[PDB]
Amino acid sequence: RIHVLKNIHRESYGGVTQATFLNGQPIIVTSGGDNSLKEYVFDPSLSQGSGDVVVQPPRYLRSRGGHSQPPSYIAFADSQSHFMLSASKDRSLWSFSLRKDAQSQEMSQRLHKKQDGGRVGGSTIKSKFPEIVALAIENARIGEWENIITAHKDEKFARTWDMRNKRVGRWTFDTTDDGFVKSVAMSQ
Amino acid sequence: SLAKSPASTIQILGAEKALFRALKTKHDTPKYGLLYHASLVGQATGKNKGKIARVLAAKAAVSLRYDALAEDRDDSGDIGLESRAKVENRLSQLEGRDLRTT
Amino acid sequence: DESDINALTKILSTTYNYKDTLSNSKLLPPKKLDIVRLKDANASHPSHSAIQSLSFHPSKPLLLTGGYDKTLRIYHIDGKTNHLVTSLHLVGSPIQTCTFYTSLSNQNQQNIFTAGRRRYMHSWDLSLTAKIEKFSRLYGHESTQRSFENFKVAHLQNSQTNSVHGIVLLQGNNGWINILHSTSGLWLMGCKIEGVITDFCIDYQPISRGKFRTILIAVNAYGEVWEFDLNKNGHVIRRWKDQGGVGITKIQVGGGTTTTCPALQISKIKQNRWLAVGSESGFVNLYDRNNAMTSSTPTPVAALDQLTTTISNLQFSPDGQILCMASRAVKDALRLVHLPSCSVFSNWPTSGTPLGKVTSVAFSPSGGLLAVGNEQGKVRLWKLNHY
Amino acid sequence: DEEDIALEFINGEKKDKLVNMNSFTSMFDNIQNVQMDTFFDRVMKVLT
Amino acid sequence: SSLSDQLAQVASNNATVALDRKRRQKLHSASLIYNSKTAATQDYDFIFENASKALEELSQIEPKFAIFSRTLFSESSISLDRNVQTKEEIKDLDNAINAYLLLASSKWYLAPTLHATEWLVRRFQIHVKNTEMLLLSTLNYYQTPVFKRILSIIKLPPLFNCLSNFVRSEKPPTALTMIKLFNDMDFLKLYTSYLDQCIKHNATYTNQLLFTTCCFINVVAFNSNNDEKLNQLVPILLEISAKLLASKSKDCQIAAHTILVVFATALPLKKTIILAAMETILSNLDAKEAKHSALLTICKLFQTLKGQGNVDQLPSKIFKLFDSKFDTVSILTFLDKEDKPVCDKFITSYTRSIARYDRSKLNIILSLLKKIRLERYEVRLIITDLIYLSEILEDKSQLVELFEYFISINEDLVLKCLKSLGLTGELFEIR
Amino acid sequence: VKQHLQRETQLKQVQQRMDAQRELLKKGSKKKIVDSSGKISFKWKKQRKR
Amino acid sequence: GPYHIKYAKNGTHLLITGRKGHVASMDWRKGQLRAELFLNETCHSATYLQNEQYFA
Amino acid sequence: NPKAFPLADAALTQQILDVVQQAANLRQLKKGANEATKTLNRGISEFIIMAADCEPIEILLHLPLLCEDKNVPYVFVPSRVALGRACGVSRPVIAASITTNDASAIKTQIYAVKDKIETLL
């Protein structure tokens, strides 16, 4: 048994639904019911004499994907109707392209560093943010600082995001009255 | 008179002129002395022959004052032999390390 | 080539996991814990002082916290929402030790005994107004007991009837332990050790059907340990010496029924296997009483040295497979040492565990669940997924 | 009494030696021309 | 990619072809005996004739080199150039070189093999073409100047990357460097394939088995604190344990015993894996030192076994196989040893398998559990299945005297098991 | 002999102050303890060496 | 761009020119290049002169 | 061990190890046999504590021989492990010299313990 790629697709959406080798090629395309299509490639062997017995494990290559759950919120990122921000119940914020579907990219949730230098809390096993109730994007100062302000399900602070970097921001705005965030806005 | 001397003295015991010039001006003292010609310090190589000159002088102080101060001593080499096993596996564990990065 | 001593090759080509699965383990794996963090237990209602003592209920899902702000709080604990059951503020009486007592006869009393640096000790009778009584009479022995701080509650059998009753045990000045009734407050007996009494613990051993025997285990500061049989008159049966150990702060037993894992039914009383003597340098000797009740200079099965300042808590998990060393002197000084292997778990606590300055610790009797109270006034709560 | 049987099952467990990073580092010095059964009991002395 | 990268690829392909005099000198001065200034002036006839002398010496020591005198060391091979024939002739002579190297891996302490493989280094360029097999064959000799020499002249493969600070150095690689070399997973797959060819062609020698087992148990020791690396590592070293147990050498069998005992005490393996491991241990047990190691290995592998199911009766096939390899006198004697091994759970499983599968040899289980002491759950399960034996078959003196032993010690426990199932007056009326 | 004694006691005092400074700059937790006069001392935390 | 190829008159050296600017003189049979120069105007052709030592 | 003269009883060894612990907190002791003999040579030791627990005791019983030359008090305690705990290191300590001071906070405790030592000489 060469290798096992575990959790290559979600079991709840069907597992790996079709996997096929492109023939003559060391690349295999998988697709699952979680709205995802991946490719995995076999690199050539690392031993220069044996080869057939030292099989390097398959690594990841390109993939396309979308939301695995129906989206819960929708906004347009700019006045040109090129990108649109889209948040789903599977707790991901995607930025989908209306012009060319290769440009669709998941906004990353990799947090910044704390401003003073203290530790940030949270679980070690990183999971995605609670699913997005509302959002408000105003790209007047885009690239300059935080640009999207978003409000999640049953939590008392609103995160920010940067659409230029396509990532989370440094700030989570609290409500200061122990109430969940019911709306967000931002000025132009 | 050798047994009632500390192990640092037994380390530097041969190198008195280098020692006291390096103390009477504020310089770095020798590390070998008369104990440099032991076979274990011969087996060591680098700065760890200073290191095992130190551990060899410590175990030699142990064995030496055992020999001078024992009364039920047996002339069989037991304390010296277990001390030598301690010094040999210590020399092994600091010749096994290497300052290179692999 | 081919169509379809090879037993190992076949079992490897069929298996995909190679370790024991979930419940066919029944005893803890060493060196890697499995411990999730729950909601902080006193997060619902904050404490106004360092949390000096902490005890679970023997049966109910209740956690009693208490500290120098002279109030004691009971929390219904669960995973999500640890709420506050009730809360009693004794004015002018800061509390230092607070214990759920539950008798063996009917298991229906549910007293809380609490005490601090005072010449009295309160006893709240749990009734869900609040009827509390005050013990303030040493029946002729007030000179040798000037503060009710260090007490422990235990069970005692009459040994001519099969009638048990609770005793509280007060650590006094000279070498004295004053044992007195937990309902009437009558001074029953006293046990004097020779030196500076620093701590003590209670061991039980069964004898026959429905009869057990209570042993008080009291340690000098120097390291010599007395064991008193006290189901008879409080007479010494064994006197031994801790190997090493010069400033001795805390002794504990474990592996059977301690005062912190209490037995609900008299036939469920067990003999303790382990005995940990934790010291001022942070050294914890660990003795195995399945063989170290005979030697009279017994050697420890291991001397742990992992945390370097004064041992102020050491508690055994109810199964008796984890010991918890803890120090209130520096921050984050808590270790969970697995035993019989006598090896500290290396994956918890990490550098980011919010342990704080650990000034109390408690183990749940059923859930497999740590509560750790620090000097900021916070009980943090963890669940061990082996249980 | 299944809790008592489970407590005696976890009570009958004996202290063992665990493998460290450096429980076997000092064997290369004396794997020189010794026999393999002497190596086996030298390993078993480390494990016990 | 870039042009200098693609040209480095074509240089690495054309590494061995001498395309002018300076490359021929730099490429022919790489000797294993002489220094560069002598080695550059030597011929093929000179190095061939003294390598043929050394192969005659090596062949009268060990007579399996004569066919290498027929093909690899013949006089047609003076003019045989390596990089002028096709891939099929190349794979023919490269498995010829692999055959020579794993035959002469054992002989590396005596100078005829140095002067003989000198000709493979200089004619067939095996320091740069067949280099992985050369390193893997002489890996044992790493404190020695012959491994210093092959490291000085070698071109190091990418799997052997940590030896790159010990090439052209005056000090040998250390043991911690050897464990860092073995700690990789692809290197572990490579070395296990090398051992598979060794075990297949029957060339496993005891110095190699010692070195291999030492580095394997040090890999397991290094990875003893990360379970995912141990779990990546299990079907490699247990597969090589199966392939070492599936051979005839007592030395390689107890090498596999060492690997199995360290691996089972490093992580708790599955019960069925441990049982199939003891089946593979017993299925080829022929020696005596192998029997000593096999009994100690099966005892520790059953000791490191936790949970519900540690001390069942081991099944009928494996119990009668263990009987055919180890009878009663062997088990009783080994328990009577004053060094006191820890044989608790295995001996409990053994006596329970006797009570389910033999039903004649019960005096011996009385004697052996008189010898060694067990725990409360062990003797509780023993007396429960003895109670079931009394209720299935008629209760004679051997079962009676067993219950007299279980009355003479711990009579409260046999009362507790009878009260959990049965009665004491009813059992005394039974027997 | 009397001035040998004066030289020896002055050297003892200056080596004692030098040794206190060297002991002070090693490691561990410590606090500056001030007496009635102003003769400062450094009291080290009760913590054994790891 | 498209690469005009040129070999030396013994086959030891190769001289390639990109249409864009990339001229590389190299020993194509070892892995030794001895000139890689990017002359950012459109080159058309090249040749060796009497050697690998000069090229136009 | 028979040849470990004056050995302390429990009360004296408890107060000896108490003054060792507070001298270790005040950085006023030299722990180890070679450092003890160095303080013996330099004459800056108040008293020497040794352990009657080392398996060669002859690695110890040489500093008595230069204690009785400088009339500095010396004493034996039964446990090298407990002496190491008192000195506040992680290793067993075989001998320990409490060094001299005249502005020391624990000068009275040092003097009381050394008088209790030289009563039994």
Swiss-Prot record, chain B:
The record places domain Nop at 1-96
Q: Where in the cell is it found?
A: Nucleus, Nucleolus
What function does this protein fulfil?
Answer: Required for pre-18S rRNA processing. May bind microtubules.
Describe its assembly: Interacts with SIK1/NOP56 and NOP1. Interacts with the trimethylguanosine synthase TGS1. Component of the ribosomal small subunit (SSU) processome composed of at least 40 protein subunits and snoRNA U3.
User: What miscellaneous comment appears in this entry?
Assistant: Present with 34700 molecules/cell in log phase SD medium.
Report the sequence similarity comment from the record: Belongs to the NOP5/NOP56 family.
Which protein, by its recorded name, is this? Nucleolar protein 58
Organism, by scientific name, is Saccharomyces cerevisiae (strain ATCC 204508 / S288c) (Baker's yeast)
List the taxonomic lineage: Eukaryota, Fungi, Dikarya, Ascomycota, Saccharomycotina
Name of the gene encoding the protein in the UniProt record: NOP58
Q: According to the record, which residues of the full protein are present here? A: 308 to 409 of 511
Curated annotation (Swiss-Prot), chain D:
Entry's localization field: Nucleus, Nucleolus
Q: How does it assemble?
A: Interacts with snoRNA U3. Interacts with MPP10. Component of the ribosomal small subunit (SSU) processome composed of at least 40 protein subunits and snoRNA U3. In the absence of snoRNA3, forms a complex with other t-UTPs. This complex can associate with pre-18S ribosomal RNAs.
Q: Any further remarks?
A: Present with 6560 molecules/cell in log phase SD medium.
What is the recorded function of this protein according to its Swiss-Prot or TrEMBL entry? Involved in nucleolar processing of pre-18S ribosomal RNA. Required for optimal pre-ribosomal RNA transcription by RNA polymerase I together with a subset of U3 proteins required for transcription (t-UTPs).
Q: What is this protein's name?
A: NET1-associated nuclear protein 1
* Provenance organism: Saccharomyces cerevisiae (strain ATCC 204508 / S288c)
UniProtKB/Swiss-Prot annotation, chain E:
- Disulfide pairs here are none
Cell compartment(s), UniProt: Nucleus, Nucleolus; Mitochondrion
Q: Which domain of life is it from?
A: Eukaryota
Q: Which residues are annotated with the PTM N-acetylserine?
A: S1
Q: What else is known?
A: Present with 18200 molecules/cell in log phase SD medium.
Q: What does this protein do?
A: Involved in nucleolar processing of pre-18S ribosomal RNA. Required for optimal pre-ribosomal RNA transcription by RNA polymerase I together with a subset of U3 proteins required for transcription (t-UTPs). Involved in ribosome biosynthesis.
Subunit composition and interactions: Interacts with snoRNA U3. Interacts with MPP10. Component of the ribosomal small subunit (SSU) processome composed of at least 40 protein subunits and snoRNA U3. In the absence of snoRNA3, forms a complex with other t-UTPs. This complex can associate with pre-18S ribosomal RNAs.
What protein family is recorded?
Belongs to the HEATR1/UTP10 family.
Protein name as it appears in the record: U3 small nucleolar RNA-associated protein 10
Q: Which residues of the full protein are shown?
A: 2 to 432 of 1769
Swiss-Prot record, chain G:
| Compartment(s) | Nucleus, Nucleolus
Start-end of each WD repeat: 1-38
Relay the record's extra comment: Present with 5800 molecules/cell in log phase SD medium.
According to its UniProt entry, what is the function of this protein?
Involved in nucleolar processing of pre-18S ribosomal RNA.
Q: How does it assemble?
A: Interacts with snoRNA U3. Interacts with MPP10. Component of the ribosomal small subunit (SSU) processome composed of at least 40 protein subunits and snoRNA U3.
Task: Give the protein's recorded name.
Answer: U3 small nucleolar RNA-associated protein 7
State the organism of origin: Saccharomyces cerevisiae (strain ATCC 204508 / S288c)
